[model samples]
Target: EFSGFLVSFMVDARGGAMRGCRHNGLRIIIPPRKCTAPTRVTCRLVKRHRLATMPPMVEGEGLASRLIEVGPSGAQFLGPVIVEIPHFAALRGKERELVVLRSENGDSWKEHFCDYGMDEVLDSPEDLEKKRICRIITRDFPQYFAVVSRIKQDSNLIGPEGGVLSSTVVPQVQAVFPEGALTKRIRVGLQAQPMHSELVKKILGNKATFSPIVTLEPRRRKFHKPITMTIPVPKASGDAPTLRLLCSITGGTTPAQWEDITGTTPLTFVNECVSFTTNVSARFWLIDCRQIQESVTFASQVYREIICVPYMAKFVVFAKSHDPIEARLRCFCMTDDKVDKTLEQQENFAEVARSRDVEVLEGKPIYVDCFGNLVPLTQHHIFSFFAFKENRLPLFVKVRDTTQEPCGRLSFMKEPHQAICNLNITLPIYTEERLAYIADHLGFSWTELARELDFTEEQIHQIRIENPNSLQDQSHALLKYWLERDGKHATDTNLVECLTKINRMDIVH
Candidate 1:
């Protein structure tokens, strides 16, 4: 039926020995009278559009049947092809002689034997062979037999008399010996002292055994404390009010190393006074960082806190001269009035001067700066408005025990690392009332509003239709979305722009 290249094949009267053409078109000729016969040809014109959804034929059957017959080979064809078969058919049909074919070009093809059930067949039964006992020779020898045979066959060579013991006896002499003589008795008594003897009588008594004197070595004392301090300075007369100075009391294996720091300082004035307050510190005795004999080794430095006198002897507020022009107020360290003589002798005068005096120090006791960058706390006018900006300050201070051994020399072990600090922070809170006011101010329908908020169509509909009363939930959801979209701690300006773009000016307040 194809209007392309044609090929002819011979057919017998019994319709035997037939083969298909290897070209686009195929025809079979049989002569009814003798050799050959001419067959009538019919043709008709078909509109291309009418065959749009019609099933395409390969040879005598549709493409679907050809795909099934071809199996994996049909996958090579250009467009989509689907092949359907019975729900449950026997493997390779009941005949079990299925021929596999592979398509080549448009008409040429080749055949191959089916490879379906090859896994189930066996090539040889050599694996089923078992071990035969008749061919096996036991190589085990019994040690008991070998040992008994040696004793029976070679006893004469081993020892005399066939290794038998000799029987002998000594003659017994019956006779009684003479008896022994008896010994004499003696008596002893202490000597008596004379009545007018001026010499004193001495009695010497010695212990069962003498032992050397035992003297134990003195033990080292350990100290640990977790504490913090604060200092406040009065601001200038009109410029700005003063903020409290804050710092941490850090401890470590070595004397607390105060790293370099930079920040704003309270206004420097002579009349200005600073106050100091401390937390309750605990002292403990440790042996190589272990509080108890059975304490396990720690992955890091460890300590135990004990109640004791405060590390600082006394707090003194004073002023030092760095430049003749300006006088700075600072604290001076003083020795504890009740300290013992040995501790007074070991006091570290240099560290004491450095601890309290501010002139020789690099940075102030406390620093207040923003998280995003170093923004001084003094830059903001009001403390309440500080939260409105996206700035968070991280403060670090260094505090050490004034009681530490002078120059840390007598303290055999390294300085312990433990400290305590306080933080005062503020953050803005978003409420549902604020969110509703925003939506109303924007004049946006729920649909447009959802789109800007990145809500899916279904979610938008569900919020409006299924759960209109979930306004609070929607407000929190929006806040979370905006918080993640913007930085977790981005500036308030970014959030203001978010509301502004949605035409919500009323929410700015």
Candidate 2:
């Protein structure tokens, strides 16, 4: 199943395009003159396990795609080349930020924002919305590349004569810069992370009500004049509660360390908003007035490392609930490396993946999606699991069984727990009966579909002669013939992915 699927092309001064075999919407376009001569070019999907490298750390967002590789071993182009990598994330506002990361050695990386300017590969307008494809333009074919998404952010160029910057997605978070705040103009970005986020919860507890995490970037930069920031607080009825300002210091990998600066930083509360003036650039948020009085012990020491299976990857989940007991773990199947029909079709890809609803306390079956074309170890295209869901609790993964893969077993879990397959998926099947079923579904399009199935005119002629009147028989014969021809190479992808190419998605899904 880990066959390392790829497609190849020969290019010259006249550039060409190659569509992905498993994912038709996935494309690689090279404009003419980008190549000096006819050079052999190939685009490959490199899953996580296959690589020793990964994308740069995403602050609060998740990775949206798999590592896409284009090679001739560090091939440099004369000009820009267009590569479309499919993503399972949405390109929404500041709440989500996606950056395309490229690396030549797989260790060092360069990140660039996506330019959704032109998409040469076309799909149905409705289907286009369902397919979240990141169109990346580059001059070099690196060892690997992928996309990473983070929290909501607003960026603007601010000069010495400063101006006000507010988040368009959520206007409540605002920063007003007075004149002479900056000595020179620079791109100033303000990002809003969730109050109780993954890294934050791992180091703190969810028992406290926190304000929106407003982080001023160009980390630790000092302003000539203190910039005023306004953050929204939960509406209170009679009297306002005492609030304290706390700053967070941690990348996603690092254990988030926090310190209370409320003693030095006095705040002004007007109705439901709190305003603070600061000259430092870092992540800032507000905590409950009473949280500091009590023991602010960390709820859980959360960490994750990759565990490899034959074609599966598992994460060891550990959690500790203090008083509030936020045992609500969140996780998503990062890879799509499957070997069955149920998981092979491109239509099965989820446009926007959220955390599993199975809570640890509920004792329900927990499983993650096993995207068939994924490589488990390719953190190169992995997501920050904690960001997709509001629950900051650790992810719960239990392998059901051995012998048959895609299943997991759980140890030390409470009773009433069901043995759900680790890679949340359906049993894959492909048979003549399935072929017969597809034939019956085909109306008059059976003949055209036969052509797409690579049935030669002579082969169609024979099938027609044998079953002159029964179109169903003819269609079934065509499919069965193609299956036999493909033999071991025959896969569910062959039929379903081809249907996608012909706009026959009405049936593939």
Q: Say which candidate scores most in lDDT.
A: 2
Please give the lDDT score at residue 64 for candidate 1: 10
Displacement of residue 504 (Cα, Å) in model 1 is: 2.8
lDDT for every model?
0.22, 0.55
What candidate 1 gets wrong by more than 4 Å, as runs, is 1-450, 469-477, 480-492
- Per-model TM-score, in order, reads 0.13, 0.53
Measured with C-alpha atoms, the lDDT of residue 89 in candidate 2 is: 56
Tens digits of lDDT, candidate 1, 145-185: 00000000101111111111110110110011111110211
What is the C-alpha lDDT profile of model 2 across 1-509, one tens digit per residue? 12245558898787888877876667788888887877887777654333666664634444666567777657767877877766655443335655777887878778653333233545554564455566778877777776775665688999999998897666878998899999899889887654335434434445445566677876677799999988887323112444566775554345445667777887786757888898877777666534455322321121111000001122322221111211112233333322122222224222222223221311122333333322122112112332112111222222233234432222222122333223333222222678778888776667777665545456678988987888787777777777775455456776777676667888886
TM-score of 1: 0.13
